[PDB]
Design an enzyme around this catalytic site. Structure first.
Site, short mmCIF file in Angstrom:
data_model
loop_
_atom_site.label_atom_id
_atom_site.label_comp_id
_atom_site.label_asym_id
_atom_site.label_seq_id
_atom_site.Cartn_x
_atom_site.Cartn_y
_atom_site.Cartn_z
N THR I 1 0.82 -1.20 0.00
CA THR I 1 0.00 0.00 0.00
C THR I 1 0.86 1.25 0.00
OG1 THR I 1 -1.80 -1.11 1.18
CG2 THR I 1 -1.79 1.29 1.17
N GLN I 2 0.71 2.06 -1.05
CA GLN I 2 1.46 3.30 -1.14
C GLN I 2 0.89 4.35 -0.21
OE1 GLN I 2 3.94 1.56 -2.83
NE2 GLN I 2 4.37 3.68 -3.44
N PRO I 105 4.65 -2.36 -0.13
CA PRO I 105 4.77 -2.36 1.32
C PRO I 105 3.41 -2.47 1.98
CG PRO I 105 4.96 -0.14 0.49
CD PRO I 105 4.86 -1.03 -0.71
#
Lengths: 199, 201, 250, 232, 228, 239, 238, 213, 215
Positions: I1-2, I105
């Site tokens: 997840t950005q 991530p």
């Protein structure tokens, strides 16, 4: 960048590259050869990214000889030129393009002599006299006033001299030595190395 | 970083410095740069340590495979061609490698120069690195083909001394290798300070 | 799964090959074709299979397949089995032209098709192409030509070719009446008329049972003449006048 | 599956392909049909007898259009027939995608016969026991193309496939000729189909499609009962 | 086809592996002897024609700088095995800066001695003698088509190996020397061959810890032969 | 692919296909070849033309590079595949290391290809046997032969095809190092060996040579006629 | 007998004969014995040789710090499953950072050998495993089979003429649980000296012993640390 | 956005002795302007004659440590013997180049005994080159520690100072001095010191405290 | 997840004598809007270990799912062997590292607390794979704020009682309620012993505001 000229005659093709293999400041090799004798009447010159030049010459020079062994005879200059153009145009739209600047010098039994002109975007051209690089901004106008289609080879060598003399007068690069080939009814004949003492 | 190589009548001379910094910080003074590929080949380390090291080790592996298949030593140009073909497949992906391929051939003396840009060329003299131009200057002053043995030793040693004196990214010990017809031999490994005391007067 | 495998490629219990010989015997019961020696020009002869009166004949070609602009081919054997090969063959010639922009020199064409056939001879274990087929055409390096493909992939450049049991005696007539030097297309047509007059069991040779196509060089072109019926009719009348000339010896 | 990939069809010492000859025999043991190319149109007609009085004649349809101008009938087994019908549909629509023009019947027969030929040679699958009769009025001249399980094809002025197809053929040769109209072709087609079928023949035993130059048409049992109520 | 590739026996082991062990037997014989001084190794070329050039027939090939080999029976399958074993030793050197020892060599070979599989090809038809010098001195290794790899003190392979092994068990002990073992080996060679023994029949291959390079004897073999 | 092995072992340790498919080479065209000290000589027999037809395409002797020469036996199609493959291979060696290709490298390629072609899953092995003649390292004359198993095997002379036992038995008397080693007598005595064929028509002879620096030259049946005439002259001189 | 061809074919009596054939092929390996105490798992095998001069084919091979396996049958499939065994050990050693419990490893082995006994185109594995290990609940002596019907025992004996050894295990399986390593090991070779014909004796070089303990890493011994183990015996009652 | 690296810092020292390899490291793991712990020893004892230290990005250090342990066990379970030191060095170099185009941000120092039984320190770099040196100082405190070792180990830039071979205990007090003197001025250093000694008889460890700020 | 959408906040854990106490709050703020003011940010794993997380809540749900599956699977092995807390720590570390290596991530900051076999355990797992053991953990701003309280008392006294620890956690959470903009006066305490795992209810704090009567 560097230079190579492409003058056509009635029954001969007079090509002449340089011998310079510099790297951005210094001239690393002053007798370098950019000539790849494809067949007994077909030459090839290359200019551009020096990682691509050797690779594409390694492709064509080792595929046309395969054609020669398989079929038992020799390509036309036309088909060889188109084959190179085809390979550039296929290699261009990929993750690995080639950035080269060719010109092909051939000799048919029937078409006689022939000159083609490539470009880094794979364009065919049937030129009477082509060049490449920065020199090509001058050396075509140095030539286009003294060109005659029915010109003899000694006049042509003289015109090379007349043109190189105007090259080494107003040009920032060095370019001390030019090698010269010629094609005829026999084959590839190498003329003498044309260098100059300037002053 | 300053390496040079030139061939002559009695074989090939290869010398290099031993300083490999990191930015503005010197890591070690004793980095052995001339990578000993074979008992008949010698490779260098010109720009980047790991790339030069890894690809020359892989080339050594490849050449040993070749010799074991043909019962026959490989040529110099063959190794240069193999290295160029292996390096060319990672073009643009950020490999810096400007090494030099030396050795004795069936033709005899052979001196090739392979880039990460793939500028595979033969020649007679070469010099790679940051202070390479200094070596070019003093070497092409002193160069001939008809040089002697001790003369060539002095030429190369003086060249690396001048290069390490002017440029900042070079220093440490000056190694000195000599390719003969049959095998290569280390001549000596001299420090800069010894040469300074010896050659300053 | 392994008690359903055929032989499919394997050598004999005695040294020979199975599918290849059976492919040849599959060739033998087909139509009859031939080509002639002509220095300028070259011709093909063909026999009509299925000459039943309720067909249409609107295709203008039953055995011929104008494959390049300067080449066609006759054919003998299983039909759509060969139509697959015609499609692939035209494709190979046309991608040659795409690669070079110069027409195909026809022998590497023939080797390409023969390699296609051979790739199913050794591995691939499928039904091999039981089709032999001719080649006529022209080039820059030899001029007018003639070729004979085989299911083995072996190809022979003949000057007077051979199809099977219907045409072995035709080749006997070709040797006993060999010609050389006369490039005259019309003498060759009289010859081929004589050949199919002996070999075909069609009594007195009505032109509906036959098919002829030629290929002559016209000034930059190499046109392919799939000729009409009336000239065949007068050719037959010419040949039976020559039969009257033959029985002038009575 | 495993992908065993070998073909069951290999050459005889006679050189024959006995599976293909058996498939042709299985076609010949099928339902009769007749297809006649007249001077302006083409007539297709099949013969569909239900096994009981329980079956309905509104669900299964033998005569089938492939485009709006290309009819297609068969004589064989419907489960294979529907497959190659659907294949021909997708194929014709791919042609109409590429060229933006209705596909000609010769081009259909080329492509369909190539697919069927491919099934004759590829691994382990049986050939399709279906003999098509494709037709359509493309560019004025109408056409009539018979195919077969062997992948081959032809072009007939008039033909028949199914039970006693040789007898129907011999009646066709004497009765039919080169030039008529669509109505006379329908007349002689019903004559040659009723020569060989059972005695009870109605508006639901047969199924007739015609091919105008205005396009393919599939007639209704209304006009069939208009016509086949003792057409001669 | 008579219970082929992938079937056991009602009593014992596989068919085709047993057939491979049978297929070894037609090959030409070879004898290796491990001595602590160094490994010696011999073979018979079985040369038929005077056109048959002797020095082109390979039996002893060279894996590494200190590892020999010997083969049996079939030829080019063994050549492929030699090729891959060389590649794997070079990979071991490439990632370890050292010598893949002789047992690790033979394990890397026998890991696909039996990986024969036509689905998910045939088993290999060659028995191999391996000789090398590891850090534990000299070694002599004998493998088979079936992968059943063992250490042998002095193995004899191929044709007439019964009497070869027997008469070799007659003379062998642990504290042999080099040249004694060499002449004792070539005695057994000229007892099991059918032709006269001369300069072109056999070839010797001796590896020492001090003589790592050149695991071969060339035309001093003639002097070695004439001493019998 | 086909999960079925053609190369299963016998009950007694043989291969039912490899040594068996050698018989296809045994049932083929004969072709011999020797190496002299400078000139190499080889040739095929049994042209067997229809005496009215063409033969410039039925040529069984070809080349891969300018320095190497080919021959084969058995059936011709497998030879065609191997030849085109090997042409591509030697030209790709030229793409690599810039030497002229050694004969040993290209024979290792051919035999290795044939071997791994026999090892694979359900593939009919090549029923040919090639003869690979070339002189590369300082012009050292060599010739290697193949085997359908794929075992390259260096000789000094060779005999394949139909009745090669009889040909090698003529070579038995024709093994002399003298042989008086002119180029013409070597060629003519190889021609005498090929004229020891079971029919020996004299005109079905197809022979070509290489002078270890030149390229392939095809002969003409008038010098071959002179060679046959001088062979008959020597046969008269022995009487 | 024509249904007695392949793995896939069921019998008309239900007993798939390929697995029976694989069992009988496992029976023609070397003899081996594995037995555990409350704190120590000892497995003892016997070597044979091809000839007099050659060395003996080894059986007891290492796997991991707490696992060692015996073997009977083929050695290629043995080394294949050994590679898989070491792999499965080091994988969980990487991920979970713990040694594996033995039972889940043997479940993985049975699931591994399930596939080649189930489809067409593979064979069962000629294999003779005797696995000794340590989870938190102590030593375990597992065995497998080519049919993957893996067993837990307290003492097994598989291989040639192993049945009399099983009678010995029967008459001393009461004794086994209590004793320490020394007399445990000599009970083990007091099975193996009945795995042999009575006209010869068990020497050093043919026998091999692998011990793992609850604090002891698995260690293999051959003739030198077996010379202490071979003394402490009497002759057989001839 | 997401940055895949973060600088944890650290200090690894190594001294190649005559028959000993001393590797010492502090146990402070930090991030930016915070303190995650005061116990994270950078050293790891692989074999009886090999100790590796890893600094830099900590997760890559852990992953690399586990991969090295796995390949150690693979070599042992295949080849019936432990690795050398240089073999481990070459294998690590192969790994670090095997992730060339997504590099490890990790400094590495392998000490340990050779096969002769002498000290051997193999330095490294993020990209995967190596060399056999006599001492390296890795991590954040490299520039604070290299010149003092150049003065004391190398005896360099000195005049008329003869060469005594470095003893064990003198090297011990050298390590204690350099870690105190480096913990004075550096921010990424302190709170413990884990001193690893490789002898011909095993591995010894020793913990000496520092200043707690 | 950005981009983490819905974040939790800081988690506090500390060992004591034979037990580990973890306590975080029950807030689901998005941006600055406290959009989900009743969520549970602590999973009670089977019998010994216990999880607490921060960052994006969806990733916490996902890892909750995957861990629950794996724990159920080992319980269905039926052998008597379970996961140690440190094993869960190792697996979670390898999971996070594998996520960040592929440029995906999982935006979290997780705390693992377990007690097994006499020994306590308190593990830390970062997003970047940075993972270690500690006597007292503090995520988010807690590593700035409540970490000095933990390190003061643990330096002044190495071992503790359950009551001392629970009271100290209450004080630290009061302080985090004082000066954190993403905090909320509702939290749950979760405590593991050898007697099992127990999650206490949504407790709250006692505040003081007597500084506000000054100017």
């Amino acid at each position: 960048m560097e230079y190579l000229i492409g003058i056509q005659g009635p029954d001969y093709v007079l090509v002449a590259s340089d011998r310079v293999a510099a790297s951005n400041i210094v001239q690393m090799k002053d007798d370098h050869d950019k000539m790849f004798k494809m067949s007994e009447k077909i030459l090839l010159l290359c200019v551009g990214e020096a990682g691509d030049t050797v690779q594409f010459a390694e492709y064509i020079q080792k595929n046309v000889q395969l054609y020669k062994m398989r079929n038992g005879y020799e390509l036309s200059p036309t088909a060889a030129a188109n084959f190179t153009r085809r390979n550039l145009a296929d290699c261009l739209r990929s993750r690995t393009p080639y950035h080269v600047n060719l010109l092909l010098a051939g000799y048919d039994e029937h078409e006689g002599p022939a000159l083609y002109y490539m470009d880094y975007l794979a364009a065919l051209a049937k030129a009477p006299f082509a060049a490449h690089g920065y020199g090509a901004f001058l050396t075509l106008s140095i030539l286009d006033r003294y060109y005659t289609p029915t010109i003899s080879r000694e006049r042509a060598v003289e015109l090379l001299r007349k043109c190189l003399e105007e090259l080494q007068k107003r040009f920032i690069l060095n370019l001390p030595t030019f090698s010269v080939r010629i094609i005829d009814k026999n084959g590839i004949h190498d003329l003498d190395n044309i260098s100059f003492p300037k002053q | 970083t300053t390496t040079l190589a030139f061939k002559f009548r009695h074989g090939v001379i290869v010398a290099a410095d031993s300083r490999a910094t990191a930015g503005a910080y010197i890591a070690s003074q004793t980095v052995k740069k001339v990578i000993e590929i074979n008992p008949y080949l010698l490779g260098t380390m010109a720009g980047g340590a790991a790339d030069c090291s890894f690809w020359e080790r892989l080339l050594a592996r490849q050449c040993r495979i070749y010799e074991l298949r043909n019962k026959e030593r490989i040529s110099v140009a063959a190794a240069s061609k193999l290295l160029a073909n292996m390096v060319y497949q990672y073009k643009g992906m950020g490999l810096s490698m400007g090494t030099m391929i030396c050795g004795w051939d069936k033709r005899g003396p052979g001196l090739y120069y392979v880039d990460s840009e793939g500028n595979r060329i033969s020649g007679a003299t070469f010099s790679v690195g940051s202070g390479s131009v200094y070596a070019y200057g003093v070497m092409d002053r002193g160069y001939s083909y008809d040089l002697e043995v001790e003369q060539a030793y002095d030429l190369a040693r003086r060249a690396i001394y001048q290069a390490t004196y002017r440029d900042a990214y070079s220093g440490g010990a000056v190694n000195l290798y000599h390719v003969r017809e049959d095998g290569w031999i280390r001549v000596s490994s001299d420090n800069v300070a010894d040469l300074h005391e010896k050659y300053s007067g | 799964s392994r008690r359903y495998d055929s032989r499919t490629t394997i050598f004999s219990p005695e040294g020979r090959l199975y599918q290849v010989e059976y492919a040849m015997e599959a060739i033998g019961h087909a139509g009859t074709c031939l080509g002639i020696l002509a220095n300028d020009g070259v011709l093909l002869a063909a026999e009509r299979r299925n000459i039943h009166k309720l067909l249409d004949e609107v295709f203008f070609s039953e055995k011929i397949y104008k494959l390049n602009e300067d080449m066609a081919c006759s054919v003998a054997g299983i039909t759509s089995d060969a139509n697959v090969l015609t499609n692939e063959l035209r494709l190979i010639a046309q991608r040659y032209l795409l690669q070079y922009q110069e027409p195909i020199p026809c022998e590497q064409l023939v080797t390409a098709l023969c390699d296609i056939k051979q790739a199913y001879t050794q591995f691939g274990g499928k039904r091999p192409f039981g089709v032999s087929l001719l080649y006529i055409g022209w080039d820059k390096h030899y001029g007018f030509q003639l070729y004979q493909s085989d299911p083995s992939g072996n190809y022979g450049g003949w000057k007077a070719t051979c199809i099977g049991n219907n045409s072995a005696a035709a080749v006997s007539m070709l040797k006993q009446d060999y010609k050389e030097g006369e490039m005259t297309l019309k003498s060759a047509l009289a010859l081929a008329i004589k050949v199919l007059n002996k070999t075909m069991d069609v009594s007195k040779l009505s032109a509906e049972k036959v098919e002829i196509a030629t290929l002559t060089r016209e000034n930059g072109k190499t046109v392919i003449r799939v000729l009409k019926q009336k000239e065949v009719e007068q050719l037959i009348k010419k040949h039976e006048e020559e039969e009257a000339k033959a029985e002038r010896e009575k | 599956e495993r992908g065993y990939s070998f073909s069951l069809t290999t050459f005889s010492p006679s050189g024959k392909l006995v599976q293909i000859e058996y498939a042709l025999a299985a076609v010949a043991g099928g339902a009769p049909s007749v297809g006649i190319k007249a001077a302006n149109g083409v007539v297709l007609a099949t013969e569909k007898k239900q096994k009981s009085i329980l079956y309905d004649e509104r669900s299964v349809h033998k005569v089938e259009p492939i485009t709006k101008h290309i009819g297609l009938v068969y004589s064989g087994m419907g489960p294979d027939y529907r497959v190659l019908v659907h294949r021909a549909r997708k194929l014709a629509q791919q042609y109409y995608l590429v060229y933006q023009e209705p596909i000609p019947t010769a081009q259909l027969v080329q492509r369909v016969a190539s697919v069927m030929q491919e099934y004759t040679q590829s691994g382990g699958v049986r050939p399709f026991g279906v003999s098509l009769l494709i037709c359509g009025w493309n560019e004025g001249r109408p056409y009539l193309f018979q195919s077969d399980p062997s992948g081959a094809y032809f072009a007939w002025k008039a033909t028949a496939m199914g039970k006693n197809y040789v007898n129907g053929k011999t009646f066709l040769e004497k009765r039919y000729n080169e030039d008529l109209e669509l109505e006379d072709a329908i007349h002689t087609a019903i004559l040659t189909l009723k020569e060989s079928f059972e005695g009870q023949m109605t508006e639901d035993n047969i199924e007739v499609g015609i091919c105008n130059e205005a396009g393919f048409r599939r007639l209704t049992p209304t006009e069939v009962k208009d016509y086949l109520a003792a057409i001669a | 086809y008579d219970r082929g590739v992938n079937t056991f026996s009602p009593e014992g082991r596989l068919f085709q592996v047993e057939y491979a062990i049978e297929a070894i037997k037609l090959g030409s014989t070879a004898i290796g002897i491990q001595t602590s001084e160094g490994v010696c190794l011999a073979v018979e070329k079985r040369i038929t024609s005077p056109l048959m050039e002797p020095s082109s027939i390979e039996k002893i090939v060279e894996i590494d700088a200190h590892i020999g080999c010997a083969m049996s029976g079939l030829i080019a399958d063994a050549k492929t095995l030699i090729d891959k074993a060389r590649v794997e030793t070079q990979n071991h050197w490439f990632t370890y800066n050292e010598t893949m020892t002789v047992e690790s060599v033979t394990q890397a070979v026998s890991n696909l001695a039996l990986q024969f599989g036509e689905e998910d090809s045939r088993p290999f038809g060659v028995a191999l003698l391996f000789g090398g010098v590891d850090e534990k001195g000299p070694q002599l290794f004998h493998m088979d088509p079936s992968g059943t790899f063992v250490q042998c003190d002095a193995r004899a392979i191929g044709s007439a190996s019964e009497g070869a092994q027997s008469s070799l068990q007659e003379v062998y002990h642990k504290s042999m020397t080099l040249k004694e073992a060499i002449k004792s080996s070539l005695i057994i060679l000229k007892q099991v061959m059918e032709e006269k023994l001369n300069a072109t029949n056999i070839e010797l291959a001796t590896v020492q810890p001090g003589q790592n390079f050149h695991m071969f004897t060339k035309e001093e073999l003639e002097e070695v032969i004439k001493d019998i | 692919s086909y999960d079925r092995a053609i190369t299963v072992f016998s009950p007694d340790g043989h291969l039912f296909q490899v040594e068996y498919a050698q018989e296809a080479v045994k049932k083929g065209s004969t072709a011999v070849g020797v190496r002299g000290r400078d000139i190499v000589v080889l040739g095929v027999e049994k042209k067997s033309v229809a005496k009215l037809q063409d033969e410039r395409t039925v040529r069984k002797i070809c080349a891969l590079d300018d320095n190497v020469c080919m021959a084969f036996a058995g059936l011709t199609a497998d030879a065609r595949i191997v030849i085109n493959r090997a042409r591509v291979e030697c030209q790709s060696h030229r793409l690599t290391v810039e030497d002229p290709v050694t004969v040993e490298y290209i024979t290792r390629y051919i035999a290795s290809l044939k071997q791994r072609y026999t090892q694979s899953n359900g593939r009919r092995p090549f029923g040919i046997s090639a003869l690979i003649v070339g002189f590369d390292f300082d012009g050292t004359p060599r010739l290697y032969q193949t085997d359908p198993s794929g075992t390259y095997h260096a000789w000094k002379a060779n005999a394949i095809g139909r009745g090669a036992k009889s040909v090698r038995e003529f070579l038995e008397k024709n093994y002399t190092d003298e042989a008086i080693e002119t180029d013409d007598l070597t060629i003519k005595l190889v021609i005498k060996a090929l004229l020891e064929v079971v029919q020996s028509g004299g005109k079905n002879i197809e022979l070509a040579v290489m002078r270890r620096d030149q390229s392939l030259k095809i002969l003409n049946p008038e010098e071959i006629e002179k060679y046959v005439a001088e062979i008959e002259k020597e046969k008269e001189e022995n009487e | 007998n024509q249904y007695d061809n392949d793995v896939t074919v069921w019998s008309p009596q239900g007993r798939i004969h390929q697995i029976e054939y694989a069992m009988e092929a496992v029976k023609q390996g070397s003899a081996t014995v594995g037995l555990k105490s409350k704190t120590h798992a000892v497995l003892v095998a016997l070597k044979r040789a091809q000839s007099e001069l050659a060395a003996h084919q080894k059986k007891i091979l290492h796997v991991d710090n707490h696992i060692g396996i015996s073997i009977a049958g083929l050695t290629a499939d043995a080394r294949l499953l050994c590679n898989f065994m070491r792999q499965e050990c080091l994988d969980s050693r990487f991920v979970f950072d713990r040694p594996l419990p033995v039972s889940r490893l043997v479940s993985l082995i049975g699931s591994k050998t399930q596939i080649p006994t189930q489809r067409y185109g593979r064979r069962p594995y000629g294999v003779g495993l005797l696995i000794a290990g340590y989870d938190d609940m102590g030593p375990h002596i597992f065995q497998t089979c080519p049919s993957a019907n893996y067993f837990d025992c307290r003492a097994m004996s598989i291989g040639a003429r192993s049945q009399s050894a099983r009678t010995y295990l029967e008459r001393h399986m009461s004794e086994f649980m209590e004793c320490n390593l020394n007399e445990l090991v000599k009970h083990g070779l007091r099975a193996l000296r009945e795995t042999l014909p009575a006209e010869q004796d068990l020497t050093t070089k043919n026998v091999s012993i692998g011990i793992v303990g609850k604090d002891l890493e698995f260690t293999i011994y051959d003739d030198d640390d077996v010379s202490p183990f071979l003394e402490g015996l009497e002759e057989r009652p001839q | 956005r997401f940055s895949p690296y973060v600088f944890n810092g650290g200090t690894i020292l190594a001294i190649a002795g005559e028959d000993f390899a001393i590797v010492a490291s502090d146990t402070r793991l930090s991030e930016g302007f915070s303190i995650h712990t005061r116990d994270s020893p950078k050293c790891y004892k692989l074999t009886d004659k090999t100790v590796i230290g890893c600094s830099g990005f900590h997760g890559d250090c852990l992953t690399l440590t586990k991969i090295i342990e796995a390949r150690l066990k693979m070599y042992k379970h295949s080849n019936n013997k432990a690795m050398t030191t240089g073999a481990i060095a070459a294998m690590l170099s192969t790994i670090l180049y095997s992730r060339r185009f997504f590099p490890y941000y990790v400094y590495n120092i392998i000490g340990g005994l050779d096969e002769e039984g002498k000290g051997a320190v193999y330095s490294f770099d993020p990209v995967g080159s190596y060399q056999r040196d006599s001492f390296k100082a890795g991590g954040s405190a490299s520039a604070m520690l290299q010149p003092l070792l150049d003065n004391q180990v190398g005896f360099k830039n000195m005049q008329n100072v003869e060469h005594v071979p470095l003893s064990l205990d003198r090297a011990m007090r050298l390590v204690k001095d350099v870690f105190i003197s480096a913990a004075e001025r550096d921010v990424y250093t302190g709170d413990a010191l884990r001193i690893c000694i490789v002898t011909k008889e095993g591995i010894r460890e020793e913990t000496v405290s520092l200043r707690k700020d | 997840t950005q981009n983490p959408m819905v974040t939790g906040t800081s988690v506090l854990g500390v060992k004591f004598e034979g037990g580990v106490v973890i306590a975080a709050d029950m807030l689901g703020s998005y941006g600055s809007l406290a959009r989900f003011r009743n969520i549970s940010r602590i999973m009670r794993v089977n019998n010994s270990t216990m999880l607490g997380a921060s960052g994006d809540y969806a990733d916490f749900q996902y890892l909750k799912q995957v861990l629950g599956q794996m724990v159920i699977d080992e319980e269905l092995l039926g052998d008597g062997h379970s996961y140690s807390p440190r094993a869960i720590h190792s697996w979670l570390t390898r999971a996070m590292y594998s996520r960040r290596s592929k440029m995906n991530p999982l935006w979290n900051t997780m705390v693992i607390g377990g007690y097994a076999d006499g020994e306590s355990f308190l593990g830390y797992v970062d997003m970047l794979g940075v993972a270690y053991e500690a006597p007292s953990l503090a995520t988010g701003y807690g590593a700035y704020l409540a970490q000095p309280l933990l390190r003061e008392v643990l330096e002044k006294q190495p071992v503790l009682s359950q009551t001392e620890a629970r009271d100290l956690v209450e004080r630290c959470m009061r302080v985090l309620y004082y000066r954190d903009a993403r905090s909320y006066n509702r939290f749950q305490i979760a405590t593991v012993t050898e007697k099992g795992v127990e999650i206490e209810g949504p407790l709250s704090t006692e505040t003081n505001w007597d500084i506000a009567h000054m100017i």
